[PDB]
Design a protein around this ligand. Structure first.
Ligand SMILES: COc1cc(OC)c(NC(=O)Nc2cnccn2)cc1Cl
Length: 271
């Protein structure tokens, strides 16, 4: 079929340091995909990691094209935008919505860790939503392989965003990959339930971080979070990464398994 390979760039979705994310519409089919334009090894890893990924809660990779020194990454379009924009400042969002997003985030991270990939920069800006509000993990620019040939490799590289980084990244030379992603998911859950970030960074110099370790939960943001999801945050936001809760145990948590959310409103008539 002629002209099926032609895609029109119709709007700027976002703009980062690596470049810009454009909305691309197929000339013939009108299928919408997002195109990440990277004006360049840094992207060669993002492409390689993206070729491995195939999960309903992970942004799909369709292919890539190189036009000189510019790389075009054909990625899944998520019309719902960023999870960040669904968080009302100093409020958050209704608890059943946050539980559904946290469930979908856990399915995505279980999958990633299961194939030996660590995202290393989980935050609401990178958690995208489709037309049906299905969460998708995006941007594998900071991601890496932590398990290869069933052998785990300890990480040492400084990566992420300070309010979401685990404290062992600032205190230890080496650390396990999986508890780092579990921690950032915990900060994401906190943000969704309180509409604010607990601390600038997880260090003792940060009074908000010291207060959390001293269990001063009568203070913000913890005061806004109900006891059942707060009990889960007490297990995620544990300084020692070896004592920190694992995802198989997050799935057994009381709040995680608490019925709260109704299914998508389906059409109905009376009489
Ligand atoms: C602010 O609105 C948006 C922002 C977006 O990205 C920054 C998108 N993008 C989107 O759906 N695709 C995407 C972006 N980065 C990596 C992988 N996939 C959609 C919307 Cl609607």
């Amino acid at each position: 079929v002629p002209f099926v390979e032609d895609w029109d760039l119709v709007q700027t979705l976002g703009e980062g340091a690596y470049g810009e994310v454009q909305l691309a519409v197929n000339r013939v089919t009108e299928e919408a995909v997002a195109v990440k334009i990277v004006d360049m090894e840094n992207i060669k890893k993002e492409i390689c990691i993206n070729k491995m990924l195939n999960h309903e809660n992970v942004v799909k990779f369709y292919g890539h094209r190189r036009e000189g020194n510019i790389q075009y990454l054909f990625l899944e379009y998520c019309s719902g935008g960023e999870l960040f924009d669904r968080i009302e400042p100093d409020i958050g969002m209704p608890e059943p919505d946050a539980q559904r997003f946290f469930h979908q985030l856990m399915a995505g991270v279980v999958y990633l860790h299961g194939i030996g990939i660590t995202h290393r920069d989980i935050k609401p800006e990178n958690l995208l939503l489709d037309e049906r509000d299905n969460l998708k993990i995006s941007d594998f620019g900071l991601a890496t392989v932590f398990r290869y040939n069933n052998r785990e490799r300890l990480l040492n590289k400084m990566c992420g965003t300070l309010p979401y980084v685990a404290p062992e990244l600032l205190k230890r030379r080496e650390f396990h990959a999986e508890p780092v992603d579990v921690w950032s998911c915990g900060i994401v859950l906190t943000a969704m339930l309180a509409g604010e970030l607990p601390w600038d960074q997880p260090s003792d110099s940060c009074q908000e971080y010291s207060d959390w370790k001293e269990k001063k939960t009568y203070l913000n943001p913890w005061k806004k979070i109900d006891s059942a999801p707060l009990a889960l945050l007490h297990k995620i936001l544990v300084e020692n990464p070896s004592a920190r809760i694992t995802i198989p145990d997050i799935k057994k948590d009381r709040w995680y398994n608490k019925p709260l959310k109704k299914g998508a409103k389906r059409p109905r008539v009376t009489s």
